Design an enzyme around this catalytic site. Sequence first.
Site, PDB file in Angstrom:
ATOM      1  CB  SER A  23      -0.947   0.001   1.206  1.00 45.12           C
ATOM      2  OG  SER A  23      -1.761   1.158   1.230  1.00 45.12           O
ATOM      3  CG  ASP A  30      -7.517  -1.899  -3.124  1.00 45.82           C
ATOM      4  OD1 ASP A  30      -8.164  -1.152  -2.359  1.00 45.82           O
ATOM      5  OD2 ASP A  30      -6.286  -2.083  -3.012  1.00 45.82           O
ATOM      6  CG  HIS A  63      -5.992  -1.494   0.659  1.00 45.60           C
ATOM      7  ND1 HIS A  63      -5.182  -1.298  -0.440  1.00 45.60           N
ATOM      8  CD2 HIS A  63      -5.396  -0.843   1.685  1.00 45.60           C
ATOM      9  CE1 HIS A  63      -4.143  -0.560  -0.092  1.00 45.60           C
ATOM     10  NE2 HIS A  63      -4.247  -0.271   1.193  1.00 45.60           N
TER      11      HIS A  63
END
Length: 217
Positions: free
Chosen positions: A111, A165, A197
Amino acid sequence: NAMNYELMEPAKQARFCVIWLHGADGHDFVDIVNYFDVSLDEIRFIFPHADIIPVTINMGMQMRAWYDIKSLSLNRVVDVEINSSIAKVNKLIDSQVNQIASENIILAGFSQGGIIATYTAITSQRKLGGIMALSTYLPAWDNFKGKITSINKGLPILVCHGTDDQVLPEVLGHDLSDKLKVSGFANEYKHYVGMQHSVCMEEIKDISNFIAKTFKI
């Protein structure tokens, strides 16, 4: 130079090393080690604390852009001056070298953190071991595209990304992978259906298999 980090020393002599970076998305991957099927007899693990990842990055990104963003004039509010953080990692690498060969260190990121692993390795003046981009887009591509080093053009890069996501959409992972492809860095693109995510179990298997197929153990 002030920084904290979790350090896992391997059972046998340290011959390899994995620098795992993390930023909401600053998940505690310290446990991830028990999730792999590869011999960790000779692998040192480096988990830098989230201060290595400045806050000012995903702010403009996920405060300005549309909920269903698809591409990147958003460049105005992304703290390129990233750089510092990169240097931190560089120092870390410089610290593991003079202790482990640079080509035996892998930069993995998730991320918010995944940015500082790729950009670093492709601007790293020395030969590194691999990149594991996980759920990460490629911001400020205009500012960092010229600073690329051909010394690692062809190093093992693993891109992973979730299909559902809604925090960091899949086309941005496609964006990172493709923008690395045309840049001269070939990579395996592995997207996971349903996954959002996060990191799943099949993905963990694939990560394991990457560390195995790159450290050639």
